[PDB]
Amino acid sequence: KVFGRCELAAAMKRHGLDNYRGYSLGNWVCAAKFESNFNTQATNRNTDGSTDYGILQINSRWWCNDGRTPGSRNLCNIPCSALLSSDITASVNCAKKIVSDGNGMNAWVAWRNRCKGTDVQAWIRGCRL
């Protein structure tokens, strides 16, 4: 599924991401935009043999198990396939564990490079929240 900007903002707010660990809703919507372009089925393979899965591009080396990644730790205790669902619950729940890791949203490259320090409120303006 490909979410619309406002539709995703509402979905994330419903799952308690607004202001979670100090990150306003706009930060999360911005991260999903540049990480997966709002596509729940986006996947990207990396040089270390790991793959990033879903709307928040969660990595198979540390967070989910896809059975083909060496040195996987599966810290979210979930199969990576669950992160490709149309319902973002699994991805959100795992993201909450990642951001609580101790490095905030820097776990998301696209967020660090294109969201951090910008007017992230722009991502929720015009939306009915």
Distance from C-alpha of 89 to C-alpha of 122, rounded to nearest angstrom = 24
3-state secondary structure the chain: CECCHHHHHHHHHHCCCCCECCECHHHHHHHHHHHHCCECCCEEECCCCCEEECCCCEECCCCCECCCCCCCCCCCCCEHHHHHCCCCHHHHHHHHHHHCCCCHHHHCHHHHHHCCCCCHHHHCCCCCC
- Residue pair 4/38 in contact (Cβ under 8 Å)? The answer is yes
Number of structural domains found in the chain: 1
Is there a binding annotation on residue 87?
no
Catalytic hit among 48, 52, 66, 87: 52
Structure tokens at 66: 């896809």
CATH code of residue 68: 1.10.530.10
Q: Is 7 a catalytic residue?
A: no
Per the structure, the complete domain to which residue 57 belongs is given by: 1-129
Catalytic hit among 7, 18, 35, 119: 35
Strands 58-59 and 51-53, bridge-based pairing: antiparallel
Q: Is 52 a catalytic residue?
A: yes
What was the elucidation method? X-ray
